[PDB]
Amino acid sequence: NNSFVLGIGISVPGEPISQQSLKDSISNDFSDKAETNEKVKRIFEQSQIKTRHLVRDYTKPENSIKFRHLETITDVNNQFKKVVPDLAQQACLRALKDWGGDKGDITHIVSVTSTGIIIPDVNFKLIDLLGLNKDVERVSLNLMGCLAGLSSLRTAASLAKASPRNRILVVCTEVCSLHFSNTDGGDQMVASSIFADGSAAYIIGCNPRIEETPLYEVMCSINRSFPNTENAMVWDLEKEGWNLGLDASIPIVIGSGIEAFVDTLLDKAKLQTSTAISAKDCEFLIHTGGKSILMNIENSLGIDPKQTKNTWDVYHAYGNMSSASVIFVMDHARKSKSLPTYSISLAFGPGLAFEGCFLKNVV
């Protein structure tokens, strides 16, 4: 009587943009100081990202980053509004076909994002787009940040467990390329090197049905909050646009609290899997937030590259797409033909806050 993710689908803006051309393009347009331009060029190189998908292709002259200061919150949001209905429809569409059922059987529709404000929200707009039951229940999980991915899985898990009749459809879609900035300092350069746009959707429910082919068994999931760190990650709504802030301590902070957290998750799991699980035997499906935050976690838990291969594939090929990035990894991971019995999924965002989930690879 545990919820199951019954299908996943992704969707991205256009084709893969080279991280190298973006490096050249952005790094050379960032300013009029070679010293400050190399400092960007450097960050890209050491980013370890091969490609990203962007609604705003900065390698195109018109979209250069040196023009962003001429745009306001109206510009990017109005645009966002023009680029997100379709992307979510696409992922939603694919995640429905992967699920298998009859879209009339979908009881819930959950929309997720923190990169733009759309009212009516994305989940409402899709009702008619996908032709779902006009009465389908709506849930708008917005403003949770990069961790929103595991936030939705978690919430949809309980929703799914409120009745076996329920079949919750979830779409996490975020567009960051619209918000790059050539101001301040480091966190700004970094952000312009790792964030990308994307949309991921999945169907979830309890008591799998005759024609449904389960992907992951969501055994349990948790979350943690850390006091006195609300400024670690900033995303402020301002007339010029969203003001981003990433503290240099984020990597190490996450790293130092990761183990204790993974331990709290494992104890909850052992309440079912009565066979004392080791994270060392688990596949790691982590939110592709950044190479430093990804390596710090690997280190602190003393885990091997084999357990986080799938997430690195996602990060190399898409980078950080905020909330969707977790789901993207899950998708590509079930495509593998060698998943341990179990998987640990991690995500972190504004807060600070950790999101964790313990799954059983059913595919």
Add this chain to the structure above:
Amino acid sequence: NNSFVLGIGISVPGEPISQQSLKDSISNDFSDKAETNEKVKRIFEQSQIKTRHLVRDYTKPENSIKFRHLETITDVNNQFKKVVPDLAQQACLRALKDWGGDKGDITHIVSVTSTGIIIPDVNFKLIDLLGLNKDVERVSLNLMGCLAGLSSLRTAASLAKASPRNRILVVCTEVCSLHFSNTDGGDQMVASSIFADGSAAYIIGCNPRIEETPLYEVMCSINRSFPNTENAMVWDLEKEGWNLGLDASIPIVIGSGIEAFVDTLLDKAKLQTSTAISAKDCEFLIHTGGKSILMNIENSLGIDPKQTKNTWDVYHAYGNMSSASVIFVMDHARKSKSLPTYSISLAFGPGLAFEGCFLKNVV
């Protein structure tokens, strides 16, 4: 079994501001055309609202509405951020004592709003403020609009039904006074006559416990979406601030679809209370959106003033506080000593969309 509202608490900014003085004040400051100023004065008079609580008291000269055009989205939102945490803490605190339980037993914290963007969201900020379990599960139901009141009840209900262990705390807090506009068209004038600020919180869970004293038994709740009406209600994010838009058809679109909707809710209810409930026998706890809306619903369902007295008390003394308005009514209603055996709760918002809920007055 099913979910129960175990406690409610409200919180509002400052003292009740006279609708008459706001009438005088904002009407005369609306423009330099007596013809336009009178049209505002008229709207206030025919608003049927006696008092409202506002973070921005327009009767005070500095807050004159004629200065609003000099502010930007940065201003109002920064102000919002600076004033909403205390209000939500206040409500939550009060809702916690009314609940009676020990705060350490709250498994979930749900934050709700659409009048401002705060990251980390309100639910996170409250963890430390209220001293809840650092691991308490977070849910950010934002951007759902005026109907978010019942959206949360609905969602927190299923959440409550995923385990008897769960005790979900929900806070809906909205601040509209910050956004009044003296631009053009009637909806702008109306909005400045009916919207107010406030915060309401409630505890909800299944299988009441020994020391808990249940307030309402939430038997079932539904929602409906209506195609080709996304523009009925607008709340756009723009550099100047939020751009509001209320279609003159809203009232009647509600009146004409309310009955069929209340019928769908009643049939779901009759699945438990085999006594073919009538609605004419139900107490009506309606979101205090406006006088035209309330009256249209009363005529369409052909209900008696006695069944909607409680909601009109709330509307007369607070006006429309978006998502919270619903909860406010539920609070003041359980204070009554003449409550029928059942209650029908309605709410509507962007989309368009209806939210409904069928409760059993257990107090």
